[PDB]
Every structure is written in C-alpha cells, then in structure tokens.
Amino acid sequence: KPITPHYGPGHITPDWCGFGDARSDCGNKHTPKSLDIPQELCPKFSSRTGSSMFISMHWNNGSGFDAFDYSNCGVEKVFYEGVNFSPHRNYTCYQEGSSGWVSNKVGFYSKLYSMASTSRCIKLINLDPPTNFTNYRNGTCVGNGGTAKMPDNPQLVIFDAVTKLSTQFVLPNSSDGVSCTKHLVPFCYIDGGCFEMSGVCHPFGYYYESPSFYHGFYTNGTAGLHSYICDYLEMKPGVYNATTFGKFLIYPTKSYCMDTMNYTVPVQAVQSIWSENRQSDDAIGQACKSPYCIFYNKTKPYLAPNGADENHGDEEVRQMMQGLLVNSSCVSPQGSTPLALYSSEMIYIPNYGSCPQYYKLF
C-alpha cells in the first residue's frame, strides 16, 4: 500500500540538527506557545529569539540587532530562520535599500546552505584581531540618518591619509573541539564610483590576499548611488592579508567555522516569514536551491491562532515540523517517508536515504 510523503523536514538518523530563532527557542518566555516545532525537539536546535544566522554573521548585540553564537553538528540539517532580517527591518547602510539587503541575504544563505551540505558542524567563531594599525576611523552608515550600524564583520576602517598597508588576520584550524576545515567569511564593499570624504573623492577598494588566495573590489568612477554589497567566501584556515589601495580597508572579525564530511547531504530549509502585515522576502526560497538544499515553502500566510502572537506559532509550519518526530527513511522535496516499497506521488531530487518509487510505474 503506497505511502503519502509528509510535507516538511525529516531525518533518517539520530544525527541531525536544526538552526533557528524564537520559533525554535525553548528559552523564550512564551514557550511552548511561541514554538513552530515540537517542544522535545528544542534540544536538537541551536536558536535564539530575535536572531538569525545572517545577523550573527555581521553584527554583535546592539543597535537593534540580537546576535547569537550559532553552533551545531549533524549529517542532516534543518534550517528555519531568517525573518529577523527581512525588509520589515527597514535597514540600509548606504543607498542599497532593503532590496539591497535582500540581495546580501540571498548571497549569505546561498553560501551557508551549500557549504553546510559538505559539512557536519557549523560554528560561529570570533577571529583574533589583526596586527595593530593606527591613525584610522571605523566605517559608519549614512543610512537612516546615520543611525544604521555598519556591520562588526567584516570591519571597515578609513585611514586619516592615503597609505600603503597590509594587515594580518587568522582563520583558525579549530575552535574548541570542532575542526574548521573551511570558513564562511564575508567580504563587503561600497560600490558606485569614488567615495566622497571631506570634499575629496577617494578610490574605494581593498582586498583579501594570501599566496593561495585573492578576493578584491575596486572603483574610481564617477560617484553615483552607493551600495553596501557583500560577497560570501569559502576560505581555508591559514594566514591572510587585508590590503588597502590607499584610503579604505576591511578585515573579518568573525567566521562560520565548518568541518568536512565525505558524503555530501542536501540541507533542509523551511520558509521563515512574518504575518502578512509585515514586509517579508523570499531570500530563503531563492537561496535554498537544488541540489544542495531542499526547500519547504509555505503555501499559506503566517497564521498563528494558537500561538503567542500573529508571528509566533504558525499552523502550517507546526504541521510540517511534525515530521522531525519520526525516524524517516527518505527525505525529499515532497517530504519525509518511512521505509516503504511504493509512494503516492513521484519523489524528485534532491533527496537522500532510501526512497519509495511511484506506484503508477508498477
């Protein structure tokens, strides 16, 4: 008798973990009303209310960002966070705007998901400060009247005068138990031609370099609309330099330390949005693509009649997350299944485990 796949995330072995926010945080005071997952699964998630893996990449606690030291391990992974950086946040650093930050948001989540698929542990870590330099200013945002905090990672600096400089930062091989066989490191820049400071238009740019690596940005065109853009990089542990072109420089202060597993396993991401009376985005949906990530989209609006509030407790997702209670045998875009011979609908890729074949073929 053919089994119907249960739409939502699953796991085939005890060795899975989740990553999330308030909707998976049993430390939040509204528990279990604010959950979108089963309560006995909280210990499998690494989650903090108000945070997201995107925020935590860029900011420390402060100026409205709630940061979190995300850390977990699992062959199989369930990602359910992101909404805490949506257009609703109304953030911008220069003139990139919200849509500009949806662009950054996709870039990050795209890199994280694909890197995660070849990893078991993911650990946000603090990098040691670079070799000291002097006569410098930290970068600042003009966005939101100068109240928008430019990220703590990567850290921007501005030299009082044009200068020749290269500075050393370290991406470690390990962080307290975990192996960092690779790192997810942000490289952000401001585009749109030369950058105006005190009536002088300086060429904007700098680079990450080492003997086996290079990533850079440069511009000295006619000034126009400036955008704070981020690239997200896979960098191997080791010693790197950050080099200026004269006036500007960034160094990373944080990375996502990740190890490596030989068998690659698609991650799972569930849609993280707000109620309809708040601006959401489809970054997760755009970032979580085949074949490295399995996307479970919400068909309905965010509706929580039995939750703590209109944004915490959604019926749809609660139903999806029910699948993480059963030791499944197949994890697919169509959902999870137990070990069975036939299926009620075609299983498509990316999948893994042992999946039933479509009955109508037999």
Ligand X SMILES: *[C@@H]1O[C@H](CO)[C@@H](O)[C@H](O)[C@H]1NC(C)=O
Among 40, 29, 15, residue whose Cα is nearest residue 321: 40
Note whether 140 binds ligand SIO by CB under 6 A.
yes
- Residue 130 carries which DSSP code? P
Q: Does 152 help bind ligand X (rule: CB under 6 A)? A: yes
Q: Which does 158 bind (CB under 5 to 8 A by kind): ligand SIO, a second copy, ligand X, none?
A: ligand SIO
d(CA 329, CA 323): 12
- Residues within window 217-256 making contact with ligand SIO, judged by CB under 6 A: 226
With contact defined as beta carbons under 8 Å apart, do 27 and 33 qualify? no
68 interacts with, out of ligand X, ligand SIO, a second copy, none, CB within 5 to 8 A per kind: ligand X
Number of residues forming the site for ligand X (CB under 6 A): 17
Residue 296 structure tokens: 């479970």
HSE, side-chain direction, 13 A CA sphere, residue 27 = 9
Asked if residue 172 binds ligand X (CB under 6 A), the reply is: no
With CB under 6 A as the contact rule, the residue among 15, 40, 196, 309 that binds ligand SIO is: 196
Single residue of 127, 156, 249, 330 touching ligand SIO by CB under 6 A:
156
Chain positions 282 to 311 lying near ligand X, rule: CB under 6 A, are 282, 285, 297-299
Token pair, residue 77, equals: 């992974």
- 252 preceded by a cis bond (ω within 30 of 0): no
Report if residue 234 touches ligand X, rule: CB under 6 A: no
The stretch near ligand X (CB under 6 A) out of 61-69, 112-120, 173-181, 340-348 is: 61-69
Q: Which of 241, 295, 298 is nearest to 274 (CA)?
A: 298
Q: Does 203 bind ligand X (CB under 6 A)?
A: yes
Binding site for ligand X (CB under 6 A): 61, 67-69, 88, 90, 138, 152, 155, 194, 203, 220, 282, 285, 297-299
